[PDB]
Design a protein around this ligand. Structure first.
Ligand SMILES: [Fe+3]
Ligand SMILES: [Fe+3]
Ligand code: NA
Length: 690
């Protein structure tokens, strides 16, 4: 499987460094590494895709391209920049000009520009995006490049087609067939090459990264001949880039295959080479250093190391919602872009949720369409990737979403703790929260809270509130043990490892497949599912909510299993040792659980609010188009999409973040449990926040 990593190159100078690295690794008896010779980034991406190479560092822009249809690569290790005191995995895209003229970012038409390359991050993807309003581009078949050519009088944009767009290669200084080329041959290529374009005075502006003026000018006197164009039509010095930049973007990263990518071997070689040939490690070879006339050979010069990129992260999540969809927008009209801007894409966990969602989309008047995934976490990933937008989450999943940057918008407002009748001001009524309780059969009279451990259990699903966070949370306060799979003997807790004791009692869907998956296909998933687990004498205790018991007994649920059950056949376990009836939950419950909340991005908050409020006026609880057509909070006690016992989606009253909504100490509770184990998505977002 691994005994030599193949590193793809794009240049003769680049191949020579590759060979140096090869023989210095041999010099020190460390990890081997072969070298491949190609002529361009796209060729190396193809190379890796057909097992003819292993890995290649690529700019943000080419991470996107490397992750699409045929190839499907992913970032396995990102570059690190800045100082050892303050390492970062991100850089800034700026626009450096000379000192003299008095123009601004909005006064660039008619001027001459100096870019790094086509489809690069700082060089194309950001500048063209910031300047789109000024381009007067009409949209598709006409390439965006064409509009740029009319904008700037002349410029050098390596990689551009000289023949179709001659204006974009006027100021490049290559000779013959090397003019406007995507290689070192063309003098004004990459960061240092584009600042040289500024230098010579060919261009008037140069779109590069922030550290480029510091890398090429020695004395601090030569740097005071340059300022930075700002988004707010202002000029400032080259050291105030923090407060003056076009964008904030991910760093370049070593990519590789998704399926058999030899991730292990890539990281092993990179860390070893980071330790023996990193920042001033050995004068006989420099990993992050190149000869005089060359620049940024195999990795970025003046880099300080690598930093492993977590398994769950893909091309898109890496690039982040802001930059990822911006790349996507360059291949779209202004009409298509603002149209997506104003529609809400709900995510659906499971085919059953998906089916209810399509019904809603048909009657939404094109304000809602749907996406889908097999689990809750996968759907959160989709909102970060910009493919989806919103979704109703249980308090437990609000934390995970919370640490991935999403925020709460509207929360489910269940019938109040006996306050009013079908409340008119439900939308402005503050949320009271629901009650987490434990449930058992009457016949088993010896079962109490002090002896529930050891018996079979019926959970909703892992990382949910009443199902997991609270029951395991109290049991953790006592024992302290992080092994949650020994608390109960056998149990059904969807989301857990299927060959685990935690999935032993699950039964899957009607065919017998899908055991212990955390969507509604599992018969015993969710509140209704956990109670079902109880009633059928699969488990002994079942951690759901009070109203779940009510809603599934005394003929309130006409399905096969719940047809003949009655409310008096069930009791609740109290913390003191006592047991009461289900109606006495107010005085016999484990803890208060905060309401479910519909979350989205910070950029989709205002439109999502005016849409949900409108759609609920139509298909709500007291909705005008209710029974006849469709109802949002109605799916026949399966809780598809929203909870059935939801009155209305309500405002949060200033609790606008995951911290303020859940509550200080609820967040404390979750974190402690997460110390024993984090999810791959939790590990993913943690990387991206740094
Ligand atoms: Fe870059
Ligand atoms: Fe809940
Ligand atoms: Na690089």
């Amino acid at each position: 499987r691994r005994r030599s990593v193949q590193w793809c190159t794009v240049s003769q100078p680049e191949a020579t460094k590759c060979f140096q690295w090869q023989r210095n690794m041999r010099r020190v008896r460390g990890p081997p590494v072969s070298c491949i010779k190609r002529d361009s980034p796209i060729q190396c991406i193809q190379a890796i895709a057909e097992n003819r190479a292993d890995a290649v560092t690529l700019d943000g822009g080419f991470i996107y391209e490397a992750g699409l249809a045929p190839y499907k690569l992913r970032p396995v290790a990102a570059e690190v920049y800045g100082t050892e005191r303050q390492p970062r995995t991100h850089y800034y895209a700026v626009a450096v000009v000379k000192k003299g003229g008095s123009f601004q970012l909005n006064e660039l038409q008619g001027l001459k520009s100096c870019h790094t390359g086509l489809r690069r991050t700082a060089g194309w993807n950001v500048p063209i995006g910031t300047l789109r309003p000024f381009l007067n581009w009409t949209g598709p078949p006409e390439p965006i490049e064409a509009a740029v050519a009319r904008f700037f009088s002349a410029s050098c944009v390596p990689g551009a087609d000289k023949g179709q767009f001659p204006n974009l290669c006027r100021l490049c200084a290559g000779t013959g067939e090397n003019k406007c080329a995507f290689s070192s041959q063309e003098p004004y290529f990459s960061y240092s090459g584009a600042f040289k374009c500024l230098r010579d005075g060919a261009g008037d502006v140069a779109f590069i990264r922030e550290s480029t003026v510091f890398e090429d000018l020695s004395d601090e006197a030569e740097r005071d001949e340059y300022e930075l164009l700002c988004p707010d039509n202002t000029r400032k010095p080259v050291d105030k880039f923090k407060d003056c930049h076009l964008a904030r973007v991910p760093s370049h990263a070593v990519v590789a295959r998704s399926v058999n990518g030899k991730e292990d071997a890539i990281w092993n070689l990179l860390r070893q080479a980071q330790e023996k040939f990193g920042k001033d490690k050995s004068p006989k070879f420099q990993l992050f250093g190149s000869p005089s006339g060359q620049k940024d050979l195999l990795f970025k010069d003046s880099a300080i190391g690598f930093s492993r990129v977590p398994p769950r992260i893909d091309s898109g999540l890496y690039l982040g919602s802001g930059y990822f969809t911006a790349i996507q927008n360059l291949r779209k009209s202004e009409e298509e872009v603002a149209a997506r801007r104003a529609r809400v894409v709900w995510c659906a966990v499971g085919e059953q949720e998906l089916r209810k969602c399509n019904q809603w989309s048909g009657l939404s008047e094109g304000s809602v369409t749907c996406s889908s995934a097999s689990t809750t976490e996968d759907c959160i990933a989709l909102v970060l990737k910009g493919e989806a937008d919103a979704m109703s989450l249980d308090g437990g999943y609000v934390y995970t979403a919370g640490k991935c940057g999403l925020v709460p918008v509207l929360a489910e407002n269940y019938k109040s703790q006996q306050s009013s009748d079908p409340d008119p001001n439900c939308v402005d009524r503050p949320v009271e929260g629901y009650l987490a309780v434990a449930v058992v059969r009457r016949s088993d009279t010896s079962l109490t809270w002090n002896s529930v451990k050891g018996k079979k259990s019926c959970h909703t699903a892992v990382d949910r509130t009443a199902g997991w966070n609270i029951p395991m949370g109290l049991l953790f306060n006592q024992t302290g043990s992080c092994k949650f799979d020994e608390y109960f003997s056998q149990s059904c807790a969807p989301g857990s490892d299927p060959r685990s004791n935690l999935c032993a009692l699950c039964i899957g869907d009607e065919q017998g497949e899908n055991k212990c998956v955390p969507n509604s296909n599992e018969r015993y998933y969710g509140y209704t599912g956990a109670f079902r687990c109880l009633a059928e004498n699969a488990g002994d205790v079942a951690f759901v909510k009070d109203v779940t018991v009510l809603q599934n007994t005394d003929g309130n649920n006409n399905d096969a299993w719940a047809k003949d059950l009655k409310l008096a056949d069930f009791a609740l376990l109290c913390l003191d040792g006592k047991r009461k009836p289900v109606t006495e939950a107010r005085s016999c419950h484990l803890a208060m659980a905060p309401n479910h909340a519909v979350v989205s991005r910070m950029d989709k908050v205002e439109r999502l609010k005016q849409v949900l409020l409108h759609q609920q006026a139509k298909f709500g609880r007291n909705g005008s188009d209710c029974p006849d057509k469709f109802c949002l909070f109605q799916s026949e006690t399966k809780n598809l999409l929203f909870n059935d016992n939801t009155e209305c989606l309500a405002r949060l009253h200033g609790k606008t973040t995951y911290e303020k909504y859940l509550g200080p100490q609820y967040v404390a509770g979750i974190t402690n449990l997460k110390k024993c184990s984090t999810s791959p998505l939790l590990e993913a977002c943690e990387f991206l926040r740094k």
